[PDB]
Amino acid sequence: EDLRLHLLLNTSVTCNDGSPAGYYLKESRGSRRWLLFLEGGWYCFNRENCDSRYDTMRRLMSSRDWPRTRTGTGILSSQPEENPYWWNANMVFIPYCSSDVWSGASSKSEKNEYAFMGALIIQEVVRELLGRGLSGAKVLLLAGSSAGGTGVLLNVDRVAEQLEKLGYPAIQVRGLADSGWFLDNKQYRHAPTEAIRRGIRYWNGVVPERCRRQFQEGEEWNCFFGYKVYPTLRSPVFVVQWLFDEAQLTVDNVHLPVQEGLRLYIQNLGRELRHTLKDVPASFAPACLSHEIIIRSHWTDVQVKGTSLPRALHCWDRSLHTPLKGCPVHLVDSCPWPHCNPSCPT
Numbered sequence: 001e002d003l004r005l006h007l008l009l010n011t012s013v014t015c016n017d018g019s020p021a022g023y024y025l026k027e028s029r030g031s032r033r034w035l036l037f038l039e040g041g042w043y044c045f046n047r048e049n050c051d052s053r054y055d056t057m058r059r060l061m062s063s064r065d066w067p068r069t070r071t072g073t074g075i076l077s078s079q080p081e082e083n084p085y086w087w088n089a090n091m092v093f094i095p096y097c098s099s100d101v102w103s104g105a106s107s108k109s110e111k112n113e114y115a116f117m118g119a120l121i122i123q124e125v126v127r128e129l130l131g132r133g134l135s136g137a138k139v140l141l142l143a144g145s146s147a148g149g150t151g152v153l154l155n156v157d158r159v160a161e162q163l164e165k166l167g168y169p170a171i172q173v174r175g176l177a178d179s180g181w182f183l184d185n186k187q188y189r190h191a192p193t194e195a196i197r198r199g200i201r202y203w204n205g206v207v208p209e210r211c212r213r214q215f216q217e218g219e220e221w222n223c224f225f226g227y228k229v230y231p232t233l234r235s236p237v238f239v240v241q242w243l244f245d246e247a248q249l250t251v252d253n254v255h256l257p258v259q260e261g262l263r264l265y266i267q268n269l270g271r272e273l274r275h276t277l278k279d280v281p282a283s284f285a286p287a288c289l290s291h292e293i294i295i296r297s298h299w300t301d302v303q304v305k306g307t308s309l310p311r312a313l314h315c316w317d318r319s320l321h322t323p324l325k326g327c328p329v330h331l332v333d334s335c336p337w338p339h340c341n342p343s344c345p346t
């Protein structure tokens with residue numbers, strides 16, 4: 001039970017219900033690598049659906065029932081057997097308790113039943129970790145899965161800007177976005193663009209500055225879609241995305257003998273996803289029907305073109321020291337149907 005809970009000392013930075021947000025930390029003395037992982041878990045965007053989430057998903061809205069420890073798994077494991085990539089790093093798990101895809105900057109108040117403080121939670125965790133050893137870091141990898149993967153895209157450059165202004169320009173900030181690269185595509189039957197548009201207003205959601213300047217007022221929802229926000233980012237970002245992501249299929253109103261219309265729909269989804277990753281140099285996109293990878297204990301098992309994700313991430317680290325012999329970083333399946341890759345999760 002190796003990561004220990006710390007509630008934020010700034011208790012004005014809160015989960016949805018006003019309880020303090022926080023982070024779980026396992027230090028690694030002598031490592032200058034820091035991994036900050038953003039949990040996922042959908043979102044809510046109005047009073048009624050946030051109230052329902054509060055009834056049955058309360059740990060995603062409140063710290064009141066959080067345990068004092070959590071076990072690090074996958075990329076958060078400290079065992080090299082489970083985590084070939086960063087087993088010796090300082091590990092931080094940031095629970096998702098803001099329901100805002102890590103974008104919010106609004107407090108609970110006279111006018112607001114809930115606080116949506118995801119963007120401020122990340123900033124406050126960073127600021128409090130600086131006094132716990134992060135000041136000595138050489139690399140800060142902001143990672144996340146699901147809504148936390150989108151949260152990486154939305155926040156990695158702000159973490160970089162925050163550290164620059166605080167006087168730490170030597171800390172290299174990088175992003176690892178897992179299962180947070182979604183398409184605003186046609187549904188199979190006739191959605192996130194509208195839910196996100198409403199959420200931004202309900203949350204006081206913030207997006208990266210260059211993306212905001214491109215899309216402008218009322219169109220900031222566009223910045224929640226990876227293929228649109230990614231080209232605006234300055235920090236190096238590695239993108240992990242199943243080609244047939246289960247959350248993508250859910251928001252597309254697909255639920256799984258497949259007939260021609262659905263076959264063509266699924267094949268087109270994989271082709272569109274692949275297309276959006278063509279110019280993403282650090283990416284890992286297997287042709288599987290699944291969701292999330294990096295904190296799963298068996299995350300080492302899947303391979304694209306014979307290369308596992310821990311290996312690809314290691315090659316990315318080397319690339320950030322011309323391509324490297326036998327150590328690739330751009331790994332996107334080309335086969336067109338779920339589980340055409342034999343290494344897909346069972």
Ligand SMILES: O=C(O)CCC(=O)N1CCc2ccccc21
Pocket residue numbers: 040041042043101145146147148150179180182192196224225247248251
């Ligand atoms: O992965 C998760 O936690 C669940 C799904 C999720 O979060 N989705 C799906 C659609 C979308 C568009 C923009 C931002 C986020 C999301």
Ligand SMILES: *[C@@H]1O[C@H](CO)[C@@H](O)[C@H](O)[C@H]1NC(C)=O
Pocket residue numbers: 010012013120124
């Ligand atoms: C606490 O967090 C709030 C919201 O981000 C910020 O405005 C304020 O400066 C912080 N206060 C302290 C003492 O860190």
